[PDB]
From a paper:
To depict the currently elusive antigenic signatures of α-HCoVs S proteins, we isolated a panel of antibodies against the [name]-229E S protein and characterized their epitopes and neutralizing potential. The S1 subunit contains the N-terminal domain (NTD) and C-terminal domain (CTD), both could be engaged in host receptor recognition and viral attachment.
We used a phage-displayed library (library F) of synthetic, human antigen-binding fragments (Fabs) to select for antibodies that could recognize 229E S trimer. Among the nine Fabs that bound the S1 subunit, only Fab [name] recognized RBD while the other eight antibodies all bound NTD. To understand if its low neutralizing activity correlates with its mode of action, we then determined the crystal structure of Fab [name] alone and [name] in complex with 229E RBD.
Numbering used by the authors:
A (entry chain H): 1 to 141, 143 to 224
B (entry chain L): 2 to 212
The structure:
């Protein structure tokens, strides 16, 4: 298994510095190029940097020329991206990726990626969310009943919601967070079920907010 | 070297033939790659060196070069193919990406299931109130949700959010939140959301009485 795991992001104030790590397994990072690709919220892909660790050859983009530096420790098989003088336009999800090459030299592409890591550049403060149950109702409309959870008043992104620790998946709809008038984020995550099923199986939503170290498992119930 | 991607977005039925084109500001060799990105996930390499399929990629994806233009084609669009597709020019020491083409599916009209959630007591004790209206598996995405407190149409105190297209039935879902002070929430009683959508002959109203 070729695997790449990012780490080291989160909230950082403007003008700050942050070092992201990309731990690689299943291959030696000296074998290939290692790339950093960033994506602003609701925008397109943008190449940040690339490194050949074995020979130490660096390659950057003009947007991050003087501030961003890409390092690599083969002892740890880990790439690093240190970012200085961070502006608000640096707010993005940062992926690390491996470049594979056509054996001939035709050109190749990024075959394996990481999960990405959100880097928010903002003077605002981290705040944990509050989780409230959106309880099922008397209504039955098509014989359908919805329940859910409301994660409210949190900074920054992201939070992750699952239902019964990922066991419950069908009928789930988790909505994108929306910036409130408060300057804080808040979202909902609902699940549809048959009305007769309400008395049988239990429903728990797991809310996770790592910038605040908030882990809540809230049980939703009728009435 | 830059990549101009057309179209900006497109809408197509299951089974159609979809084509996405990237033009290069300067001449480039056949070092174009095609990636697919589903929402909230890392991009997946579909095609490399303009015309070659990466392994595991279905045969419905194909790549072609016409001089300075590069084309990715889906022969028969599937519901799971909803995604933003990107083109990349580069060799591993510098790559530039296209702006991306968002591809969504066209399907038959589906009417939303509509549900209403009153604020929790736990939230009222916090001094705020959030009433949530949910629309479930409706297509098309265009819909209007209007909040009525005591049969009075409100404005400016509610925010909505929409999921991305489902990958099996190609539908959307919406969530509208009316946010009021515990005081103004307790000063009224009847709370309703009225949904107007194409699949609904007459608009649907879901409501509750506080307590």
């Amino acid at each position: 298994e070729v695997q790449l795991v990012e780490s080291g992001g989160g909230l950082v104030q403007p003008g700050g510095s942050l070092r992201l790590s990309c731990a690689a397994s299943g291959f030696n990072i000296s074998s290939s190029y290692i790339h950093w690709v960033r994506q602003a919220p609701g925008k397109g892909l943008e190449w940040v940097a690339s490194i050949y660790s074995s020979y130490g050859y660096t390659y950057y983009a003009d947007s991050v020329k003087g501030r961003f530096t890409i390092s690599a420790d083969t002892s740890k098989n880990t790439a690093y991206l240190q970012m200085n003088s961070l502006r608000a336009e640096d707010t993005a999800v940062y992926y690390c990726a491996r470049w594979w090459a056509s054996v001939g030299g035709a050109g190749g592409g990024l075959d394996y990626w990481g999960q990405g890591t959100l880097v928010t550049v903002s003077s605002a403060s981290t705040k944990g969310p509050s989780v409230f149950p959106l309880a099922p109702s008397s209504k039955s409309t098509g014989g359908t009943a919805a329940l859910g959870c409301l994660v409210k008043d949190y900074f920054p992104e992201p939070v992750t919601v699952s239902w019964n620790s990922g066991a419950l998946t069908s009928g789930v709809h988790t909505f994108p967070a929306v910036l409130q008038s408060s300057g804080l984020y808040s979202l909902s995550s609902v699940v549809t079920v048959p009305s007769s099923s309400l008395g049988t199986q239990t429903y728990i939503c797991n809310v996770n907010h790592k910038p605040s170290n908030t882990k809540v498992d809230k049980k939703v119930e009728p009435k | 070297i830059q990549m101009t991607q057309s179209p900006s977005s497109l809408s197509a039925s299951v089974g159609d033939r979809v084509t996405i084109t990237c033009r290069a500001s300067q001449s480039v060799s056949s070092a174009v790659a095609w990636y697919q990105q589903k929402p909230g996930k890392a991009p997946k390499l579909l095609i490399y060196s303009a015309s070659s399929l990466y392994s595991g990629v279905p045969s419905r994806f194909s790549g072609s070069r016409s001089g300075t233009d590069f084309t990715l084609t889906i022969s028969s669009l599937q519901p799971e193919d909803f995604a933003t597709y990107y083109c990349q020019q580069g060799y591993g020491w510098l790559i530039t990406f296209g702006q991306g083409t968002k591809v969504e599916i066209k399907r038959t009209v589906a009417a939303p299931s509509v549900f209403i959630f009153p604020p929790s007591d736990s939230q009222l004790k916090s001094g705020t109130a959030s009433v949530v209206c949910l629309l479930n598996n409706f297509y098309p995405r265009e819909a209007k949700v209007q909040w009525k407190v005591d049969n009075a149409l409100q404005s400016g105190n509610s925010q909505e959010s929409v999921t991305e297209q489902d990958s099996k039935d190609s539908t959307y879902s919406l969530s509208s939140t009316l946010t009021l002070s515990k005081a103004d929430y307790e000063k009224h009683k009847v709370y309703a959301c009225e949904v107007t959508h194409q699949g609904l002959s007459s608009p649907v109203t879901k409501s509750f009485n506080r307590g």
